[PDB]
Amino acid sequence: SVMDICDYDESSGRWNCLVARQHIEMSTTGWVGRFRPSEPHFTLDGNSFYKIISNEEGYRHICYFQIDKKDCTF
Amino acid sequence: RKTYTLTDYLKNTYRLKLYSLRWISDHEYLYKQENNILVFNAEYGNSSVFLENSTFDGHSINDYSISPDGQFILLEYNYVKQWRHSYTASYDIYDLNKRQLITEERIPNNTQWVTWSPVGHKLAYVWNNDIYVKIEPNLPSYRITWTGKEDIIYNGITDWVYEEEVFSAYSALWWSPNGTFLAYAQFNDTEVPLIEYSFYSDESLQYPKTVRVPYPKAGAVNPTVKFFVVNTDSLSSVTNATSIQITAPASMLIGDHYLCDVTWATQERISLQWLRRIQNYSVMDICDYDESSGRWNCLVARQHIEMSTTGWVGRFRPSEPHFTLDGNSFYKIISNEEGYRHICYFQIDKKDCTFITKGTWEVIGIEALTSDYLYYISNEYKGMPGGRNLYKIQLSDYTKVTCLSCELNPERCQYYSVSFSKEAKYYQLRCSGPGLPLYTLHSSVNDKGLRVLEDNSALDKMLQNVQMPSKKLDFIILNETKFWYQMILPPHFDKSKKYPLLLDVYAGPCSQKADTVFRLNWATYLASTENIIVASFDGRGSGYQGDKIMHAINRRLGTFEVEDQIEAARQFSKMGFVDNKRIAIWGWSYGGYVTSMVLGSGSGVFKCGIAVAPVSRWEYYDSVYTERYMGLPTPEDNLDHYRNSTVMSRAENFKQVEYLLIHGTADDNVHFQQSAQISKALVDVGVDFQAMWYTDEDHGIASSTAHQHIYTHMSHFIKQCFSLP
Amino acid sequence: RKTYTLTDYLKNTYRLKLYSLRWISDHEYLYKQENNILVFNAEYGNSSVFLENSTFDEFGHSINDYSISPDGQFILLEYNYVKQWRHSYTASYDIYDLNKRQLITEERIPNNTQWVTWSPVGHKLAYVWNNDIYVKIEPNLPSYRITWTGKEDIIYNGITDWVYEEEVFSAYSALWWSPNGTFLAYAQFNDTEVPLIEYSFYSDESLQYPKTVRVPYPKAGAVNPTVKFFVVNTDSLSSVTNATSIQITAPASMLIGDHYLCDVTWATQERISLQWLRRIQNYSVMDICDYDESSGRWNCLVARQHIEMSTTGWVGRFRPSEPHFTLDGNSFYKIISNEEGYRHICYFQIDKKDCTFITKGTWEVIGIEALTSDYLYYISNEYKGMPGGRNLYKIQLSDYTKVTCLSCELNPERCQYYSVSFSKEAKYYQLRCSGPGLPLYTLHSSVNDKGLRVLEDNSALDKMLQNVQMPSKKLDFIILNETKFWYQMILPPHFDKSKKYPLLLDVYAGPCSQKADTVFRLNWATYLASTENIIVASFDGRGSGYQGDKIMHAINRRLGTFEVEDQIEAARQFSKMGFVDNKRIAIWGWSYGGYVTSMVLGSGSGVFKCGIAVAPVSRWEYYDSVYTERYMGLPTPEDNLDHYRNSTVMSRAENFKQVEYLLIHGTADDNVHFQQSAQISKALVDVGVDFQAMWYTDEDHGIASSTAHQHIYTHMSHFIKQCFSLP
Ligand SMILES: *[C@@H]1O[C@H](CO)[C@@H](O[C@@H]2O[C@H](CO)[C@@H](O)[C@H](O)[C@H]2NC(C)=O)[C@H](O)[C@H]1NC(C)=O
Ligand SMILES: CC(C)Cn1c(CN)c(-c2ccccc2)c2cc(OCC(N)=O)ccc2c1=O
Numbered sequence A: 001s002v003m004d005i006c007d008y009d010e011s012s013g014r015w016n017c018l019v020a021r022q023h024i025e026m027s028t029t030g031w032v033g034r035f036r037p038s039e040p041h042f043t044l045d046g047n048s049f050y051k052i053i054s055n056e057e058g059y060r061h062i063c064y065f066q067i068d069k070k071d072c073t074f
Numbered sequence B: 001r002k003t004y005t006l007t008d009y010l011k012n013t014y015r016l017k018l019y020s021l022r023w024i025s026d027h028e029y030l031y032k033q034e035n036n037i038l039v040f041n042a043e044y045g046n047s048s049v050f051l052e053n054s055t056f057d058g059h060s061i062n063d064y065s066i067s068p069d070g071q072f073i074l075l076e077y078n079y080v081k082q083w084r085h086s087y088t089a090s091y092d093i094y095d096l097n098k099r100q101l102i103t104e105e106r107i108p109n110n111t112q113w114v115t116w117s118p119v120g121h122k123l124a125y126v127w128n129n130d131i132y133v134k135i136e137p138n139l140p141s142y143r144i145t146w147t148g149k150e151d152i153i154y155n156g157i158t159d160w161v162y163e164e165e166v167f168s169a170y171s172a173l174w175w176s177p178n179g180t181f182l183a184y185a186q187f188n189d190t191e192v193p194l195i196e197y198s199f200y201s202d203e204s205l206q207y208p209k210t211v212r213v214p215y216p217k218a219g220a221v222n223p224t225v226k227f228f229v230v231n232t233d234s235l236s237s238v239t240n241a242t243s244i245q246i247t248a249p250a251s252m253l254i255g256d257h258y259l260c261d262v263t264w265a266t267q268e269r270i271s272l273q274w275l276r277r278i279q280n281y282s283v284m285d286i287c288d289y290d291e292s293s294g295r296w297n298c299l300v301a302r303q304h305i306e307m308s309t310t311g312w313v314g315r316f317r318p319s320e321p322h323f324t325l326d327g328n329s330f331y332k333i334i335s336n337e338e339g340y341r342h343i344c345y346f347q348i349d350k351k352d353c354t355f356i357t358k359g360t361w362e363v364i365g366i367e368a369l370t371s372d373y374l375y376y377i378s379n380e381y382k383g384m385p386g387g388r389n390l391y392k393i394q395l396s397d398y399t400k401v402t403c404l405s406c407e408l409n410p411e412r413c414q415y416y417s418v419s420f421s422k423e424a425k426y427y428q429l430r431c432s433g434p435g436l437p438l439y440t441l442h443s444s445v446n447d448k449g450l451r452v453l454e455d456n457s458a459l460d461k462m463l464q465n466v467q468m469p470s471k472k473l474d475f476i477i478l479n480e481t482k483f484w485y486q487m488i489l490p491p492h493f494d495k496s497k498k499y500p501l502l503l504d505v506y507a508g509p510c511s512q513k514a515d516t517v518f519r520l521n522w523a524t525y526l527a528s529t530e531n532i533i534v535a536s537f538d539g540r541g542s543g544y545q546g547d548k549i550m551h552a553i554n555r556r557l558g559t560f561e562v563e564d565q566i567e568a569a570r571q572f573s574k575m576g577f578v579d580n581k582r583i584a585i586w587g588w589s590y591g592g593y594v595t596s597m598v599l600g601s602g603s604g605v606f607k608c609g610i611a612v613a614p615v616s617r618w619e620y621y622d623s624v625y626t627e628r629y630m631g632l633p634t635p636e637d638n639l640d641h642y643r644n645s646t647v648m649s650r651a652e653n654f655k656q657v658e659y660l661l662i663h664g665t666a667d668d669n670v671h672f673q674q675s676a677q678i679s680k681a682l683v684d685v686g687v688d689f690q691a692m693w694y695t696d697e698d699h700g701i702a703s704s705t706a707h708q709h710i711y712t713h714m715s716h717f718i719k720q721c722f723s724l725p
Numbered sequence C: 001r002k003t004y005t006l007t008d009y010l011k012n013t014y015r016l017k018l019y020s021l022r023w024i025s026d027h028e029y030l031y032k033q034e035n036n037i038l039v040f041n042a043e044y045g046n047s048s049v050f051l052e053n054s055t056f057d058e059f060g061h062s063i064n065d066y067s068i069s070p071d072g073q074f075i076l077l078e079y080n081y082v083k084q085w086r087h088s089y090t091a092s093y094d095i096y097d098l099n100k101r102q103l104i105t106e107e108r109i110p111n112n113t114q115w116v117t118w119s120p121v122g123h124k125l126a127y128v129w130n131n132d133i134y135v136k137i138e139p140n141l142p143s144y145r146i147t148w149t150g151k152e153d154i155i156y157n158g159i160t161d162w163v164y165e166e167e168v169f170s171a172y173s174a175l176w177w178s179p180n181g182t183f184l185a186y187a188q189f190n191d192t193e194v195p196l197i198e199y200s201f202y203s204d205e206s207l208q209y210p211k212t213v214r215v216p217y218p219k220a221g222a223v224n225p226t227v228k229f230f231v232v233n234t235d236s237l238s239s240v241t242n243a244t245s246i247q248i249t250a251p252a253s254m255l256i257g258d259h260y261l262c263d264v265t266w267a268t269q270e271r272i273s274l275q276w277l278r279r280i281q282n283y284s285v286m287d288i289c290d291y292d293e294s295s296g297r298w299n300c301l302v303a304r305q306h307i308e309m310s311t312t313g314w315v316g317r318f319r320p321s322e323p324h325f326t327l328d329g330n331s332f333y334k335i336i337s338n339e340e341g342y343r344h345i346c347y348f349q350i351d352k353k354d355c356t357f358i359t360k361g362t363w364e365v366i367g368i369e370a371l372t373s374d375y376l377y378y379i380s381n382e383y384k385g386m387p388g389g390r391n392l393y394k395i396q397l398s399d400y401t402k403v404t405c406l407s408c409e410l411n412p413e414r415c416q417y418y419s420v421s422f423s424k425e426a427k428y429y430q431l432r433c434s435g436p437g438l439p440l441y442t443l444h445s446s447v448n449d450k451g452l453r454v455l456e457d458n459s460a461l462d463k464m465l466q467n468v469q470m471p472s473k474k475l476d477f478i479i480l481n482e483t484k485f486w487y488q489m490i491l492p493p494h495f496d497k498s499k500k501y502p503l504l505l506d507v508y509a510g511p512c513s514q515k516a517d518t519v520f521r522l523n524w525a526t527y528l529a530s531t532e533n534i535i536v537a538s539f540d541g542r543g544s545g546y547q548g549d550k551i552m553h554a555i556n557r558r559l560g561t562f563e564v565e566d567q568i569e570a571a572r573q574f575s576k577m578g579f580v581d582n583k584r585i586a587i588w589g590w591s592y593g594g595y596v597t598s599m600v601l602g603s604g605s606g607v608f609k610c611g612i613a614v615a616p617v618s619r620w621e622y623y624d625s626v627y628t629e630r631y632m633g634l635p636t637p638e639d640n641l642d643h644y645r646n647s648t649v650m651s652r653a654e655n656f657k658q659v660e661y662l663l664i665h666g667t668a669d670d671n672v673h674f675q676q677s678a679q680i681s682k683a684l685v686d687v688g689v690d691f692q693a694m695w696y697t698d699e700d701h702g703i704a705s706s707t708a709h710q711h712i713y714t715h716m717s718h719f720i721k722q723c724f725s726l727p
C-alpha cells in the first residue's frame, strides 16, 4: 500500500502528489492493516502525522511520520 | 569602376580580420599568426611564440585548449559535426612543459565533449553518452555515470532540443569554481518521438539511410531531466562514484518542465533555474552543500520566481545570475515593471530586488562583476536599439554610471562587445560597425586605451577601389511607436530614381535585423552590383525595445510580424525611391515562414519571393521554441490559432506572386516536411512556383558547394523577377 | 479556328471514347451503357439488360469494379479500393447471388483482401489475405486456408512481391487455376534478405511526424527474393485436416544459383508448364509437369524440359514468351527469336526437342492471340514493313503458308494499329484500332471474318476536332549504317518546310522501347505542336524493339551508350532535314527516358539547348535487379561493374554547364527512387551547375494525382516555352 500526500497548486488550480512524500506500508508476513491500512492523523500544519502500524515485532503501535522522511518513530 | 560581385561574396574576396584571443590568465592572452600561436602580454605588449598549430607532427588540429594552470594542452582533431553545437572528436594531451604527448590512457575516439576544471588540470569528458573524470592526464578515468544509451539517455550532454533551444550548447556539465564538484544534467528521450528522414550519402551508397532523431514537435512528449552533482575529489577507485541528485522544486514537478540555467555561486553554492513547459513561469533555486551529509539542500525561502503575465519569461530563456564573490547576492537582467529589461540586485534571503537601471531601453547582458563595479552592455546610447555599448556601473552608487565605449569612436563604432581578462584588469573591445570592425585593448585600472589590436586597414585599402553600398539605419513611427529599419543602398544612391526593393526578413520573436553592424553579405552584392535596395524592418515581435513590442505577438505567431513587414514595404515605397512594381521579399527559417505568409497574404505589394527552410505550420516545429510563443496546440489551449497560422491555408493567394521554395533534405531543424507540405498545398490549388531541394544539406545549407549554389540560384531568381540583366 | 491548348489536355475537353467489353460465353459479352450493365449477342444483338444500376445505389458503398462468376450465378463486387504499386491493391468484396437475388452476408470475404479470383468455370473463389491463400467452394461457405506462412513484407503466398509485380508477372496475382478449377497453383515469395528501400511519406498536413515507408526492393546486385512453387487440390479440401500443397521444384540447372519463376501456363486439366529464368537472364527452361494419381505428386520429366537461350543478349522481350498449348496439351506454339534474330511463332512438341517455325521474315510476331484447332491468330508488324504498325493475321493450321490478314485492309488510311479480343471459343472477335486515325472499335465473326458492326467510331470527337487546328503525325525512317531506324514527328498545323521550327525530342529509348508507331494520341505534344508550334519528335534507335535482335540486343551490357548516341544523331538528322531551328532543340523524358535525356544533356554534344528529366534513372545500381541486370548483368568486378561505373548521369555533371536542365521527381516514388534524382542534384551542385528542380510531395512514379499531373505539365510547359523564347 502506498500513501500519497497531495498539495493544491494555487496558480495551477490542480493537485500534485510529490513522490518524495509517498509512504510505503507493506507486510512481509501477511496483509497490511488490521482489515485495511490505518488512517493517518495529521498535526495542525499537516507537516506530520501519527499512524498505527505494525512494529518490527509484529505489534501495532503509533508511529510518528514526517511528511518528507521515509523513517518514522514509534 | 568595380563592384562587390556575387563571386566576391561567395569566395570571401574581401575578408574581415578578427582579433580572437583567449585569456590564459589575467595578464596574457593567445593569438594566431597564420599558423603559429603567440602569448601576448596585455600589460607591456611584448609576446612570445608558443607552438606551430595547423597539422602538428600526424593529424590536422581542429582546436586546442590550455589547462588553467598551463601544464597541459588538449588537442582536438577528427572533428565530426553533429547539430548546431554538438560534434564528436578525438583528443590528445601534452605535458605543456615537456611538449610530449600523454601516450597512456588516451582520451577515447568519438568523445562527445571534454572540459578542464576551472582551476588545475582536472578533465571531464563524455563518451557513449556517459560522464568520465580524469584527475591526471596520464591516470585512468573514473566513470561517473553508467546509464548512457544512444538517443535515449544523455549523461552530461544535451539532446537535440536542449542543445538547439535551451542551452545553445552540447555540454550539460558544470565544474565548481575550484574544480571540486562536477554538476551535470541527464536527459531522457525514451518516449520522445523520432523525426525520420532519408540521408542519401555518397553516390556509392546503394540504399539511402534513414536518419532517426528524437525530436519533440509542438505538443509531443518532451524529454525529462534530472540534475546531479558529484565530488570529483574523494573519487574512489574500488567503487562506483555516487552522484547527489538535486531535484527540481515542487511547483515544477507538478507538470512538464525544463532546466534552463545552471550557475555556480561559490565552491559550495550552486543555483538552478527551472522553467514550466508553459514558459510564463520559472523558478530559481539556490543550493548550499551539506558537509555533514554529503548532500545538497536548497531552501524554499531562498527560492525566487520569474513571472510573466503578458508573455513568456526571458528573451529566449530566463537570464542568468552573476553572483558577488561571497554568494549571498547576485544580479539578474529581468523585465521591469513596465516592460524594459534591466539589471536587478537580489539578496538571497528576500524576494523584492531593486532595479539598478531603468529607462526606455534594455540591457543586453551582464559581462563582468567585481567588488566595486559591474560591467554591462546595453542599447541606451542615442536611444538606438540596434547599438551596443559598454557601461561601467558603481555598485557603491547606482546613479553614477559611465559609458566606456559610447564615445571612443562615435561615427565608426556603435556596436561593441567585450572580453575581459581572467580577473578584469584588462579587456578587449570588439566594435562590429557601423564602420569597418575595430579591435582595441583597454586597462580597466583607469579605463584607458592601451592599443589597437586590429583596425582592418587592409580591407579598408582595397574597399576604396570598390563601389560599396551605403547603410541607412532609422525609424518610422506607427501608431505613435518607433519602428526601426535598415537599408542597404546602392552606391551613388540618387533618390529621384526608382529602385527595386528586396525585403530581407527574419521577424521572429526578439529578432533584430536593423542594427549598427557592418556586413559583407549577399545584400552587399545585390546593392553594389544589381542596384537593389535590400531592407529589413524590426516590427512587432522584435527584441531589445521592451515587452510591449516583443510580447506583441504572444500566442499569435503569423499575425502582427507578418502584417508589419507589409506596411514596412508600403512605408518604403512611400519614401519615393522604390519601384512599387519590383518589391521582393525573402527569408530563412522564421523569415521563410513570414515571407511565405506575406506572399500568401493577398496584399498586392510583393511581386515575388524566396523562402528558405521555412516553417510552414507550427505543429511541425520543436516544442521548446514553438510553445514558448504559441502554447500547446490543443482545443483547450491554442489549437485554433496553430490551424489559422499555416502557410498551406494561403496557397490560393500564391496565384498572385512568383515563389521560390528552397529546403535542405537533411534539415534536422526545420524539417523538409515543412516545405513538402507547402509544395503539396501549392500543387493542389494549381499554383505554379519555383522549387529547389538540396540533397543532404541541413538548415545551414552550409556546404561550400551548396552555399555557393543556393545564392547563385536565388540571385538568378531575384534578377529575373526584377527584370535585371 | 482555335488550337489544341494545355488546358484542353489537362482538363480533358476532347474525350477519346473506348468500348470496354467482357466476353463471358463464346457468343456473348458484357457492356456498360448508362452505368446499367447490359449483355449483347454477337450473332444478332437482342441484347436486353443484365444488371440495372438501380440495384447497387442503396449498397452504401462505391462500386469500384465487379466480376461475374464464370457459370454466371454470382457477382463479386469490389469496393474500398486502395492502390499499392502499379498493379497491386487491396479492397473489400461482397458477393451477390444473382438467382436468389440477395447479397451473401455469411462467411464473407474479409476487408483488406489483396487479390480475388474465380475458378475459370463454375464459381469457386481463391483469394489472398494477410499474405496467405484462402479457397471457397461455395460463396456462402467458410474459406479453406491453404497456406499458414504468410508474413508482411517477408513471405508472400499467392501474390507477388515488389520486383515480381513490376518486372516479372506484371500483376499482383500469383494464383493460377487449372482450366476446370480443380487445382490451384501458386507462387510463394520469400524476401527475408531483400534489403529495404526507405523513404518519407508526409501524408496530410495533419500528420505531425513523417511516416517512413519500407519496401523490399532488390537494387542491382542485391539479395533477390527466392521463389517456390505449389499446387493444391481444391476438390479434396477438408475442415479437419490441413490442405497439403505439392511443391514443383525448379530444374537442376536453375537451382544451381539465383533464378526466377517467369511464367505459368496450364496445358490441360492435369498438365502445367512452368518457365524458369536464371538470374543472368540469357538461359531459361520450360518444365512440363504432369499430375500422378497413385503418388499425388507432379512429375516434371527431364526429357520434356525445353531450353530457350540467347547468345547475343537476353531471353524474351522482357521475359520469355508464354506457350499456347493445343487442346490435348501435347504441343504448343510460342514466339521465339529465330536464327535471324527475328521473333516468330515456333511449334513445339512435348516429347520432341526441335520446333518448326510457321512464320518468318524481317518483321516480328507481337503476340499469339488465339488458337483453335483450325487457325492460329496472331498480331504482327509485317504489314508494309512498318515496325510501328499492328495487325491481326490468321494462320491456317492445315497449311501454315496460308495466312490471311484480317485487319490490314479493313480501313488502311484510318487504321494501322490493332488489338483484338476473342470470344471464349474464338468464334467472334472485337478489333480495336488505335490509329493513325481516330480509334475505331468493331465486332467481327470468325466464321467468314465478316464485319458485323461498328461498336465505337468516335464521330463525337471528330465533329468537334474539325474546329481545332490539329497537328499532323509523320511516321517515317532515316538510314544509319544500312539499317532503317524509325521516328515520328508531331508537326504543327499548317506546317511549312520553309520555316525553322523549334524541336522537342520525346525520348524513352529503353530496351525494346518503341516510340515511333501509328497510334493516335491526345497529349502534351499535341499541345506543344498545336499551340506552341514545336515539333515533338521521337526516334527508335538501337536497343528499340519489334525490329529484330540485332537492333534490340545492340545495347546489351551497355546501357547509356548506343541508345544515347542515336538520340543525338536523330537530332542531327532532323536539323539536316532543314526545317529545325538548331538554336532551339530540347529533349525530355521519363524513367529510362529521363536517364537518356540526362545522359544526352551531359554528353557535350552541343546539339541540345535544354532538357527535362522526370523520375530519371541516374545510376543502374539504384534500379531494381530483374530489369537492370537483364541488360547490365551484375555490378561486380567479375561481370560488369566498370560499365555500371561509366554509365551514370552524375559523372557527366560538369557538362550540364552546357545546357538548361529541369529535374523533376516525386518523393514517394517506389519504382525509380527519389534517391536517383537526389544524387543527380547533388552532383550538379558539387560542380557549380545551375538548374531547375521540382519535387512532388508524396507523388509516385506516375505523378498521376489529378492536381499533380496538372502541375507537372504546366511547369514543364513554362520551362520549354522559356527555353524556346516563346511568349
Ligand atoms: C527513462 O525514462 C523511462 C520512462 O520514460 C524509464 O523507463 C520506465 O522505467 C520503469 C522502471 O525501469 C519501467 O518499469 C517502465 O516500464 C518504463 N517505461 C518505459 C516507457 O520505458 C527509464 O527507466 C528512464 N531511465 C533513466 C536513466 O532515467
Ligand atoms: C534561439 C536560439 C537558442 C537558437 N536559434 C533558433 C532556434 N529556434 C532559430 C530559429 C528560429 C525559428 C525557427 C527556426 C530556427 C534561429 C533563427 C535565426 O534566423 C536567421 C534569420 N532568419 O535571419 C538565427 C538564429 C537562430 C537561433 O539561434
Ligand SMILES: CC(C)Cn1c(CN)c(-c2ccccc2)c2cc(OCC(N)=O)ccc2c1=O
Pocket: C166, C167, C168, C170, C318, C507, C508, C510, C589, C590, C591, C592, C593, C594, C617, C627, C672
Ligand atoms: C517492362 C514492364 C515489365 C514494366 N515497365 C518498366 C520496368 N520497371 C518500365 C521502366 C523502364 C526503365 C526504367 C523504369 C521503368 C517502363 C517504362 C515506361 O516508360 C515510358 C516512357 N518513358 O515513355 C513505360 C512502361 C514501363 C513498364 O511497363
Ligand SMILES: *[C@@H]1O[C@H](CO)[C@@H](O)[C@H](O)[C@H]1NC(C)=O
Pocket: C108, C109, C110, C111
Ligand atoms: C470491415 O469488414 C467487416 C467484416 O469483414 C464489416 O462488418 C465492417 O463493417 C467493415 N468495416 C470496418 C470499419 O471494420
Ligand SMILES: *[C@@H]1O[C@H](CO)[C@@H](O)[C@H](O)[C@H]1NC(C)=O
Pocket: C149, C155, C190, C191, C192, C193
Ligand atoms: C525464408 O527465409 C529464409 C531464407 O533466407 C529461411 O530461413 C526460411 O526458411 C524461409 N521461410 C519460408 C517460409 O520459406
Ligand SMILES: *[C@@H]1O[C@H](CO)[C@@H](O)[C@H](O)[C@H]1NC(C)=O
Pocket: C148, C239, C240, C241, C242
Ligand atoms: C493448421 O496448421 C496450423 C499452422 O501450422 C496449426 O497451428 C493448426 O494445428 C492447423 N489447423 C487446422 C485447422 O488443422
Ligand SMILES: *[C@@H]1O[C@H](CO)[C@@H](O)[C@H](O)[C@H]1NC(C)=O
Pocket: C180, C182, C269, C270
Ligand atoms: C476437372 O478435372 C479433374 C482432373 O482432371 C477431373 O477429375 C474432373 O472430372 C473435372 N471436373 C469436371 C466438372 O469436369
